[PDB]
Design a protein around this ligand. Structure first.
Ligand SMILES: Cc1cc2nc3c(=O)[nH]c(=O)nc-3n(C[C@@H](O)[C@H](O)[C@H](O)COP(=O)(O)O)c2cc1C
Ligand SMILES: Cc1cc2nc3c(=O)[nH]c(=O)nc-3n(C[C@H](O)[C@H](O)[C@H](O)COP(=O)(O)O)c2cc1C
Lengths: 230, 230
């Protein structure tokens, strides 16, 4: 069917033309996102649509000079939001890590619906997690209140590049039957050879990134917004 | 188009027939999940397929006595997995909170592709966050190693019910233009009235749950697995 063909044809697009996304298409992308499942129907996700060209230039820099944040037809920022709940009832305890986990999982579900809706219309896109490296600055720029935090952005627009589909680890590595199965390093070596053909190896690149520190300012940032304190 | 029609037609299915999901259908649902975007191509999601009927009964009780976990044709468990990376290179530091946020976001994105693929074939499903009620006991049952943690499960199967689509908060409440906008409590009242017509109000029910403690055992659980320590 068309749904599965769309899911399997995905590739991140990082070059866009200047053709805008119509109001009808944008309203449909947001509705597709809203139709996503929500943990306990809590509805903990907020989207900040950035149209101001000066804020977009600042966001591209805050993302690590990723130019497509400025050139994209639409830039959406996904945020955890327990301020809606806190405004309704001030007795809400939003600082439990469980709530940040729900915020992250639900944001991913919603965002994927938005991206899939866009891709089905012939649009292209890419998630922007780079915003987290300058989290406090992005948070202030968007005026996010207490009980709210930035997670990632999303570029949407008409493609001006056609990259090849990137291979993933095989299903027998990622999927386990009944109990977790120990890793066979021969599968990692085969995947590394598959990635070298597409393009330092994959395993050497990813484990080398994790051998150092991974954005150490993230927990103090979440805590400063009143999230994940216990 | 068909992808958008499938996305908007979603409703959680909690009643299934005894008809199984074929091998061709299951392999497609997994391949759809793998086609999802991955933060820094880290591929930190592991899926545990539970076919053992004795384990299913235990998971149903651990999930807060949710019978559909036992009667579903397929029950997939989504987990954060940095053990594959640690097996390749022991020097990997997997304890930074940033890495748990990547794990949670990436799992949500992957899981949604799996559900959408299933829903497009005429199947139904529901996410099961209830596994977190007894996270440490669910972890021991599935044999998850260090640097790995359970997030949620997913029931999949042929529907034996036809629920009406549940309305969400309007687009103007969830989407903010350029800067975060303050909440107009009239919109929450309008929404509560829309939810009363569908069926204490939505706003009072969700904020009442958040006024209590939300799974306080979660951070210690992640910490016990070597995750979210700093
Ligand atoms: C990660 C996550 C966890 C969920 N866990 C449960 C669960 O344990 N039990 C259940 O019956 N529903 C669960 N749901 C499903 C719903 O509560 C649901 O999405 C919702 O109330 C909105 O209804 P709909 O999906 O039918 O539109 C979960 C949803 C998400 C996104
Ligand atoms: C939450 C998340 C954040 C991401 N952040 C970035 C980013 O900041 N910039 C970028 O160029 N791509 C980013 N990506 C996209 C990928 O690097 C990408 O999904 C990947 O390498 C696999 O390639 P494909 O999506 O083309 O299949 C992100 C993906 C996810 C899931």
């Amino acid at each position: 069917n068309n749904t599965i063909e769309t899911i399997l044809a995905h590739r991140s697009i990082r070059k866009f033309t200047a053709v805008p996304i119509t109001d009808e298409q944008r309203q449909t992308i947001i509705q597709a996102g809203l139709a996503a499942s929500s943990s306990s129907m809590l509805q903990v996700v907020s989207i900040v649509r950035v149209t101001d060209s000066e804020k977009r230039n600042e966001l591209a820099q805050f993302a690590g000079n990723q130019a497509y944040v400025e050139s994209a037809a639409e830039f959406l920022v996904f945020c955890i939001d327990y301020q809606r709940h806190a405004t309704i009832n001030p007795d809400v305890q939003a600082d439990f890590t469980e709530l940040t986990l729900i915020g992250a999982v639900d944001s991913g579900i919603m965002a994927q619906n938005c991206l899939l809706a866009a891709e089905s219309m012939g649009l292209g896109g890419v998630y922007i997690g780079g915003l987290r490296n300058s989290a406090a600055q992005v948070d202030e720029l968007l005026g996010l209140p207490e009980n709210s935090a930035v997670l990632f952005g999303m570029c949407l627009g008409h493609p001006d590049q056609n990259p090849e589909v990137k291979p993933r680890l095989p299903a027998h590595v990622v999927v386990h039957e009944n109990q977790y199965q120990e890793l066979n390093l021969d599968d990692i070596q085969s995947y590394d050879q598959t990635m070298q053909a597409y393009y330092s190896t994959w395993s050497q690149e990813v484990t080398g990134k994790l051998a150092g520190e991974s954005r150490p300012h993230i927990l103090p940032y979440l805590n400063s917004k009143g999230l994940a304190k216990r």
